[PDB]
Amino acid sequence: ESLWAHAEGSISEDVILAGARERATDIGAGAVTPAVGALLCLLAKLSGGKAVAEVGTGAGVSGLWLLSGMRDDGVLTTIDIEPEHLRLARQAFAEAGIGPSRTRLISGRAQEVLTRLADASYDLVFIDADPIDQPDYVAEGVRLLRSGGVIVVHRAALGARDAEVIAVREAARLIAEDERLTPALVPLGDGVLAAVRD
Amino acid sequence: ESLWAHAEGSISEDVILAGARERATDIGAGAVTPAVGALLCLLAKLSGGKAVAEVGTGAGVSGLWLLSGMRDDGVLTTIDIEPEHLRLARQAFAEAGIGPSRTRLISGRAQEVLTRLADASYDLVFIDADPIDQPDYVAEGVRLLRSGGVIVVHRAALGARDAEVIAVREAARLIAEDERLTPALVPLGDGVLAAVRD
Ligand SMILES: C[S@@+](CC[C@H](N)C(=O)[O-])C[C@H]1O[C@@H](n2cnc3c(N)ncnc32)[C@H](O)[C@@H]1O
Ligand SMILES: C[S@@+](CC[C@H](N)C(=O)[O-])C[C@H]1O[C@@H](n2cnc3c(N)ncnc32)[C@H](O)[C@@H]1O
């Protein structure tokens, strides 16, 4: 527990991220912790960082962290059902100086958007929308990953009969039994499940 | 804290790893937790997994985990000051079916061995010997990393005036201020600091 607090407390954020967090709490949208963000940046950088897809833009906190680990020519495709959240995220990306060609924001239900994105074309897929939908996102997410890509599920550790906890464990099951995936659970924020494809 | 226990408890190990752990406790050598091991395997796989260097072989627990994420043609170079620990690790690698050309075990003080290994030739450097020596290992370790390689420090979170805690923080300082490194702290086991080179 002291180990966990030490890790969470390891990271400080700039004024842009602070502005994005303020907007996240106003709209009642979650936001990953700074230490989760640092991990997302590391994993984007390890993954190659050219094409990253995000399910659940929020106010752009996770997107800013992912972009700081991506290549200059990299494109973050981020998906949200709420146009208002997308507008706030686009503002944060603008305030950070992110070139407009490095982000592609898509308004809609991610269960439908993901099907339209090209198989084996993405270096990292980050899943951070409703946990009850994690199983659908994992099935579609894994298909988008090229060889050596990483799928990253936030809220991976969340009554043992709840419909939402059934979905989280069922998604962890999908990853644990997929022979093409090499996974590790990371106790940061609400819990991060990461897995590399073969 | 419940998050951390959930992560640590996520992983089960085969009978070979169990044999290696038994030998580690007999010789009084540490061994990374299973959840740390799963993370090392993920990071080796992300790093490319062709040339991995390890400082502090122990009885081979961390080495077995690293090897399971490396390529078939990959070579784990592991270094220990104790020939007895190397003999136990070599036995575990043998019991796991690891081809002898996939491991290179080197007997000696790692402060001297690392200097002899070739700069920018390694995909992952794992540091898990005495914490008081972490600053020397980091300076030498980073030099061995090719572009996109990962340095991984175990016991990264360990009185605030102790010579050993000064060294740990001083090594975390070296990584945090190195512009070529992208780091994240991970609260697993005794604490894992990972950082990707540019
Ligand atoms: C936890 S917030 C995202 C926070 C963001 N990842 C961050 O760290 O900054 C969850 C987001 O998912 C969105 N969402 C919920 N259901 C969705 C769906 N079916 N498709 C796409 N987005 C959805 C919500 O509008 C909300 O913005
Ligand atoms: C914590 S144990 C290693 C455990 C191993 N990494 C694992 O998880 O299975 C530390 C090891 O470092 C070795 N060691 C201590 N000082 C060293 C040095 N200066 N150079 C190389 N090895 C050293 C010890 O012999 C011991 O085997």
XYZ file of C-alpha atoms and ligand atoms in Angstrom:
450
model
C 0.000 0.000 0.000
C 2.868 2.373 0.784
C 4.432 1.042 -2.419
C 1.312 2.035 -4.344
C 1.086 5.541 -2.840
C 4.773 6.099 -3.598
C 4.162 5.233 -7.253
C 1.013 7.335 -7.598
C 2.847 10.245 -5.989
C 5.872 9.968 -8.272
C 4.564 12.207 -11.082
C 3.759 15.912 -11.402
C 1.748 17.413 -14.279
C 2.003 20.680 -16.211
C -0.628 23.436 -16.343
C -2.288 22.039 -19.511
C -2.977 18.692 -17.847
C -4.276 20.563 -14.802
C -6.699 22.443 -17.044
C -7.856 19.179 -18.622
C -8.452 17.585 -15.197
C -10.515 20.575 -14.094
C -12.728 20.130 -17.163
C -13.031 16.382 -16.527
C -14.490 16.900 -13.060
C -16.936 19.549 -14.339
C -18.484 17.169 -16.898
C -18.349 14.306 -14.425
C -15.944 12.331 -16.622
C -13.214 10.192 -15.112
C -9.543 10.795 -15.768
C -6.602 8.469 -15.300
C -4.192 9.270 -12.485
C -0.860 10.901 -13.350
C 0.980 7.643 -12.632
C -1.354 5.776 -14.988
C -0.667 8.506 -17.544
C 3.101 8.036 -17.233
C 2.581 4.318 -17.818
C 0.461 4.987 -20.908
C 3.234 7.216 -22.269
C 5.845 4.523 -21.664
C 3.690 1.866 -23.344
C 2.910 4.073 -26.348
C 6.625 4.702 -26.773
C 7.394 0.973 -26.472
C 4.614 0.118 -28.914
C 6.139 2.230 -31.700
C 3.712 5.086 -31.263
C 2.538 5.683 -34.838
C -1.147 4.711 -34.659
C -2.874 4.654 -31.262
C -6.613 4.159 -30.732
C -8.461 5.283 -27.596
C -11.931 4.206 -26.451
C -13.283 6.929 -24.152
C -11.651 10.298 -24.776
C -13.075 12.031 -21.723
C -11.627 15.535 -21.418
C -8.341 14.381 -22.981
C -6.188 13.597 -19.940
C -5.248 10.082 -21.114
C -4.892 11.364 -24.684
C -2.358 14.022 -23.674
C -0.296 11.390 -21.886
C -0.462 8.990 -24.832
C 0.512 11.746 -27.275
C 3.608 12.602 -25.231
C 4.905 9.084 -25.894
C 3.949 8.869 -29.557
C 5.996 9.842 -32.593
C 5.743 13.289 -34.155
C 3.999 11.774 -37.176
C 1.822 9.588 -34.951
C -1.967 9.758 -34.990
C -4.104 9.318 -31.878
C -7.581 8.166 -32.937
C -9.841 8.721 -29.953
C -13.518 7.832 -29.713
C -16.237 9.212 -27.477
C -20.001 8.980 -27.463
C -20.232 12.570 -26.116
C -19.480 15.407 -28.561
C -19.121 17.731 -25.553
C -16.263 15.635 -24.163
C -14.609 15.568 -27.591
C -14.829 19.365 -27.775
C -13.121 19.681 -24.386
C -10.441 17.159 -25.364
C -9.792 18.944 -28.671
C -9.296 22.174 -26.695
C -6.720 20.532 -24.434
C -4.868 19.064 -27.417
C -4.860 22.545 -28.963
C -3.544 24.177 -25.775
C -0.724 21.595 -25.695
C 0.380 22.530 -29.200
C -0.620 19.192 -30.705
C -0.674 19.495 -34.481
C -4.179 18.858 -35.802
C -2.960 16.004 -38.004
C -1.783 14.068 -34.919
C -5.317 13.598 -33.580
C -8.438 12.104 -35.115
C -11.504 12.480 -32.913
C -14.534 10.355 -33.717
C -18.006 10.931 -32.296
C -20.038 7.769 -31.759
C -20.511 4.498 -29.922
C -17.149 2.767 -29.855
C -18.719 -0.686 -30.320
C -19.551 0.487 -33.857
C -16.528 2.723 -34.569
C -13.937 0.047 -33.782
C -15.404 -2.357 -36.359
C -14.722 0.282 -39.034
C -11.021 0.691 -38.186
C -8.499 -1.394 -40.091
C -7.337 -4.740 -38.692
C -3.701 -5.073 -37.601
C -3.033 -1.343 -38.142
C -2.571 0.017 -34.597
C 0.397 0.051 -32.210
C -1.617 0.570 -29.021
C -5.314 0.295 -28.147
C -6.373 1.949 -24.867
C -9.765 0.989 -23.415
C -11.263 3.369 -20.860
C -15.045 3.763 -21.357
C -17.764 1.829 -19.434
C -16.402 -1.375 -17.828
C -19.559 -3.333 -18.691
C -18.470 -3.039 -22.346
C -14.873 -4.203 -21.837
C -15.484 -7.657 -23.426
C -16.666 -6.150 -26.726
C -13.829 -3.632 -26.738
C -11.207 -6.332 -26.147
C -12.432 -8.571 -28.977
C -12.427 -5.623 -31.393
C -9.319 -4.029 -29.911
C -7.122 -7.113 -30.271
C -8.056 -7.383 -33.972
C -6.758 -3.829 -34.553
C -3.322 -4.598 -33.114
C -0.410 -5.217 -35.393
C 2.282 -7.658 -34.321
C 4.018 -6.190 -31.299
C 1.077 -3.938 -30.488
C -0.295 -3.472 -26.968
C -3.866 -3.468 -25.741
C -4.313 -1.589 -22.468
C -7.496 -1.863 -20.362
C -8.157 0.667 -17.589
C -10.458 -0.192 -14.636
C -9.205 -3.770 -14.901
C -9.445 -4.608 -11.183
C -12.979 -3.437 -10.276
C -20.363 -8.044 -5.138
C -18.860 -10.812 -7.255
C -22.138 -11.275 -9.132
C -22.584 -7.720 -10.404
C -23.192 -7.401 -14.147
C -20.302 -4.935 -14.359
C -17.852 -7.119 -12.416
C -18.868 -10.129 -14.515
C -17.928 -8.147 -17.625
C -14.564 -7.042 -16.214
C -13.576 -10.576 -15.231
C -14.933 -11.914 -18.515
C -12.685 -9.462 -20.383
C -9.674 -10.395 -18.254
C -10.564 -14.005 -19.120
C -10.589 -13.189 -22.849
C -7.068 -11.783 -22.591
C -5.684 -14.451 -20.252
C -6.792 -17.299 -22.568
C -5.790 -15.619 -25.851
C -2.651 -17.448 -26.967
C -1.645 -14.440 -29.095
C -1.372 -12.145 -26.040
C 1.288 -11.713 -23.347
C -0.351 -9.907 -20.390
C 0.543 -8.203 -17.107
C -1.688 -6.544 -14.528
C -0.417 -3.253 -13.114
C -1.938 -1.866 -9.838
C -2.053 1.809 -10.788
C -5.149 4.018 -10.722
C -8.170 1.737 -11.074
C -5.955 -1.081 -12.354
C -4.304 -1.423 -15.771
C -4.256 -4.680 -17.760
C -1.707 -4.542 -20.596
C -0.963 -7.284 -23.117
C 1.356 -7.455 -26.115
C 0.304 -9.244 -29.366
C 2.278 -11.731 -31.007
C -3.687 -1.753 -1.277
C -6.451 -4.140 -2.344
C -5.522 -3.132 -5.893
C -1.932 -4.185 -5.244
C -2.843 -7.544 -3.664
C -5.174 -8.279 -6.582
C -2.312 -7.704 -9.024
C 0.242 -9.729 -7.066
C -2.287 -12.549 -6.793
C -3.099 -12.559 -10.505
C -0.352 -14.985 -11.595
C 0.354 -18.676 -11.004
C 3.703 -20.351 -11.750
C 4.660 -23.775 -13.103
C 6.661 -26.450 -11.264
C 10.021 -25.273 -12.702
C 9.570 -21.779 -11.278
C 8.525 -23.345 -7.974
C 11.764 -25.331 -7.941
C 13.769 -22.176 -8.659
C 12.050 -20.283 -5.815
C 12.812 -23.104 -3.391
C 16.499 -22.850 -4.316
C 16.433 -19.054 -3.954
C 15.278 -19.233 -0.341
C 17.886 -21.903 0.500
C 20.797 -19.700 -0.632
C 19.179 -16.645 0.910
C 18.836 -14.937 -2.477
C 15.847 -12.765 -3.285
C 13.461 -13.534 -6.111
C 10.993 -11.270 -7.860
C 7.310 -11.906 -7.225
C 5.285 -13.706 -9.903
C 3.521 -10.458 -10.827
C 6.882 -8.724 -11.254
C 7.932 -11.679 -13.403
C 4.880 -11.302 -15.651
C 5.770 -7.632 -16.069
C 9.365 -8.492 -16.976
C 8.069 -10.913 -19.616
C 5.775 -8.261 -21.078
C 8.586 -5.689 -21.175
C 11.059 -8.116 -22.756
C 8.490 -8.893 -25.434
C 7.825 -5.178 -26.019
C 11.550 -4.445 -26.135
C 12.131 -6.830 -29.054
C 13.605 -9.563 -26.910
C 16.797 -10.421 -28.803
C 19.515 -9.323 -26.360
C 18.627 -8.927 -22.674
C 21.142 -8.274 -19.891
C 20.479 -9.072 -16.225
C 22.410 -7.796 -13.199
C 21.863 -10.273 -10.354
C 20.921 -13.731 -11.601
C 19.971 -15.156 -8.222
C 18.563 -18.665 -8.636
C 17.114 -17.749 -12.046
C 13.528 -16.780 -11.208
C 13.683 -13.407 -13.001
C 15.688 -14.995 -15.824
C 13.023 -17.636 -16.480
C 10.377 -14.928 -16.687
C 12.488 -12.781 -19.009
C 13.246 -15.761 -21.257
C 9.539 -16.537 -21.647
C 9.092 -13.130 -23.285
C 12.200 -13.194 -25.455
C 12.583 -14.482 -28.997
C 13.681 -18.039 -29.725
C 17.013 -16.729 -31.008
C 17.294 -14.298 -28.096
C 20.196 -14.353 -25.654
C 19.817 -13.587 -21.951
C 23.184 -12.420 -20.594
C 22.951 -12.652 -16.824
C 25.620 -11.632 -14.333
C 26.195 -12.734 -10.762
C 29.057 -12.385 -8.330
C 28.247 -15.840 -6.860
C 29.172 -18.895 -8.959
C 26.877 -20.967 -6.720
C 23.867 -18.852 -7.698
C 24.834 -19.125 -11.370
C 25.002 -22.915 -11.047
C 21.496 -22.998 -9.564
C 20.170 -20.652 -12.254
C 21.765 -22.727 -15.026
C 20.006 -25.793 -13.581
C 16.632 -24.048 -13.680
C 17.203 -22.895 -17.261
C 18.092 -26.491 -18.143
C 14.972 -27.890 -16.448
C 12.856 -25.399 -18.433
C 14.259 -26.659 -21.722
C 16.100 -23.430 -22.492
C 18.580 -24.048 -25.289
C 22.123 -23.416 -24.069
C 22.712 -20.797 -26.766
C 19.877 -18.645 -25.357
C 21.711 -17.954 -22.092
C 25.126 -16.499 -21.355
C 26.018 -16.593 -17.669
C 28.910 -14.450 -16.491
C 30.612 -14.796 -13.116
C 31.908 -11.539 -11.658
C 31.178 -8.112 -10.237
C 28.631 -6.487 -12.511
C 30.234 -3.038 -12.136
C 33.124 -4.478 -14.174
C 31.217 -6.859 -16.485
C 28.818 -4.207 -17.794
C 31.680 -1.984 -18.995
C 32.814 -4.859 -21.240
C 29.436 -5.309 -22.963
C 28.818 -3.472 -26.215
C 27.131 -0.058 -26.191
C 23.669 0.253 -27.751
C 23.395 -3.528 -28.282
C 20.702 -4.599 -25.784
C 16.896 -4.524 -25.900
C 16.345 -4.711 -22.137
C 18.598 -4.249 -19.102
C 17.225 -5.588 -15.795
C 18.893 -4.403 -12.577
C 18.302 -6.513 -9.473
C 21.489 -6.830 -7.363
C 22.370 -4.657 -4.308
C 20.392 -1.374 -4.245
C 23.413 0.602 -3.015
C 24.946 -0.032 -6.462
C 21.917 1.059 -8.507
C 23.519 4.384 -9.604
C 26.511 2.642 -11.207
C 24.283 0.046 -12.845
C 21.989 2.703 -14.325
C 24.826 4.733 -15.859
C 26.297 1.594 -17.443
C 22.922 0.034 -18.203
C 21.580 3.007 -20.160
C 24.699 2.993 -22.377
C 23.979 -0.635 -23.358
C 20.456 0.146 -24.563
C 19.738 0.480 -28.228
C 17.071 2.917 -29.368
C 13.745 1.655 -28.084
C 15.386 -0.428 -25.373
C 14.133 -0.553 -21.781
C 16.054 -0.343 -18.537
C 14.213 -1.926 -15.613
C 15.276 -1.377 -11.979
C 13.902 -3.643 -9.240
C 13.764 -2.468 -5.585
C 13.094 1.035 -6.899
C 10.892 2.189 -4.000
C 12.955 1.209 -0.924
C 15.383 6.458 7.365
C 15.698 8.990 4.555
C 19.423 9.395 5.221
C 20.477 5.762 4.847
C 23.356 5.148 2.436
C 21.219 2.585 0.609
C 18.163 4.848 0.307
C 20.391 7.700 -0.875
C 21.631 5.435 -3.671
C 18.123 4.349 -4.693
C 16.844 7.921 -4.886
C 20.048 9.020 -6.604
C 19.473 6.351 -9.268
C 15.831 7.366 -9.688
C 17.181 10.915 -10.070
C 19.593 9.790 -12.807
C 16.704 8.302 -14.777
C 14.217 11.114 -14.129
C 16.651 13.789 -15.402
C 17.965 11.809 -18.394
C 16.358 13.440 -21.428
C 16.879 10.234 -23.438
C 14.620 8.196 -21.110
C 10.836 7.910 -20.762
C 10.109 6.410 -17.310
C 7.248 4.962 -15.262
C 7.221 3.595 -11.724
C 5.235 0.397 -11.202
C 4.224 -0.662 -7.621
C 4.814 -4.398 -7.956
C 7.058 -6.496 -5.712
C 9.654 -4.161 -4.212
C 8.887 -1.531 -6.853
C 9.858 -1.528 -10.537
C 11.212 1.547 -12.348
C 11.108 1.092 -16.135
C 12.262 3.587 -18.755
C 12.448 3.435 -22.541
C 15.412 4.976 -24.469
C 15.052 7.253 -27.201
C -13.495 7.395 -17.716
S -14.088 8.560 -18.985
C -12.635 8.641 -20.056
C -11.452 9.331 -19.402
C -10.231 9.412 -20.301
N -9.855 8.088 -20.799
C -9.072 10.053 -19.548
O -8.335 9.387 -18.811
O -8.848 11.254 -19.683
C -15.185 7.458 -19.937
C -15.592 8.055 -21.295
O -16.193 7.066 -22.113
C -17.307 7.614 -22.800
N -18.214 6.513 -23.203
C -19.151 5.829 -22.475
N -19.711 4.892 -23.278
C -19.142 4.969 -24.508
C -19.334 4.264 -25.692
N -20.227 3.279 -25.779
N -18.570 4.577 -26.788
C -17.631 5.593 -26.726
N -17.458 6.313 -25.556
C -18.197 5.984 -24.464
C -17.863 8.695 -21.883
O -18.481 9.747 -22.607
C -16.609 9.196 -21.174
O -16.112 10.338 -21.839
C 17.836 -10.189 -5.308
S 19.073 -11.438 -5.786
C 18.661 -11.653 -7.532
C 17.316 -12.323 -7.746
C 16.967 -12.516 -9.211
N 17.045 -11.252 -9.943
C 15.577 -13.128 -9.339
O 14.560 -12.425 -9.315
O 15.457 -14.342 -9.485
C 20.560 -10.386 -5.887
C 21.732 -11.082 -6.601
O 22.750 -10.147 -6.913
C 24.025 -10.717 -6.664
N 25.011 -9.626 -6.474
C 25.272 -8.854 -5.373
N 26.248 -7.971 -5.696
C 26.611 -8.169 -6.989
C 27.547 -7.560 -7.819
N 28.313 -6.558 -7.388
N 27.666 -7.988 -9.117
C 26.881 -9.023 -9.595
N 25.968 -9.647 -8.761
C 25.832 -9.205 -7.483
C 23.820 -11.698 -5.519
O 24.727 -12.788 -5.578
C 22.391 -12.176 -5.753
O 22.409 -13.386 -6.483
